[PDB]
DNA sequence: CACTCTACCGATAAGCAGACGTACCTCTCGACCCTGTGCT
């Protein structure tokens, strides 16, 4: 709205860090796929479905 | 028929050992030996 905020903001430069935790590295979904040979249950791990 | 010395099955603890330990998730990195015996 271009309107002047009622509160005054604490604004300034701050040193931030990008961390090795990226959402796309973590997002995982399984419907069906590989199973363990012995127990025949879904295998472990995002990387292996 | 008053005694006190050993037999008992009891209980006592005793030291023993053996037995247990949040959840779910991501990734990387490394994985026998020793000696008989035929080959050439």
From Swiss-Prot:
Domain of life: Eukaryota
Cell compartments where the protein resides: Nucleus
Role this protein plays: DNA-dependent RNA polymerase catalyzes the transcription of DNA into RNA using the four ribonucleoside triphosphates as substrates. Second largest component of RNA polymerase II which synthesizes mRNA precursors and many functional non-coding RNAs. Proposed to contribute to the polymerase catalytic activity and forms the polymerase active center together with the largest subunit. Pol II is the central component of the basal RNA polymerase II transcription machinery. It is composed of mobile elements that move relative to each other.
Family, per entry: Belongs to the RNA polymerase beta chain family.
Miscellaneous comment as given in the Swiss-Prot or TrEMBL entry: The binding of ribonucleoside triphosphate to the RNA polymerase II transcribing complex probably involves a two-step mechanism. The initial binding seems to occur at the entry (E) site and involves a magnesium ion coordinated by three conserved aspartate residues of the two largest RNA Pol II subunits.
Subunit description: Component of the RNA polymerase II (Pol II) complex consisting of 12 subunits.
Entry protein name: DNA-directed RNA polymerase II subunit RPB2
Residues of the whole record sequence present: 1066 to 1114 of 1210
């Amino acid at each position: 709205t271009g309107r002047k905020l009622v509160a005054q903001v604490f604004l300034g430069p701050t040193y931030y860090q990008r961390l090795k935790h990226l959402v796309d590295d973590k997002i995982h979904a399984r419907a069906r796929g590989p199973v363990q040979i012995l127990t025949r249950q879904p295998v472990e791990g995002r990387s292996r479905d």
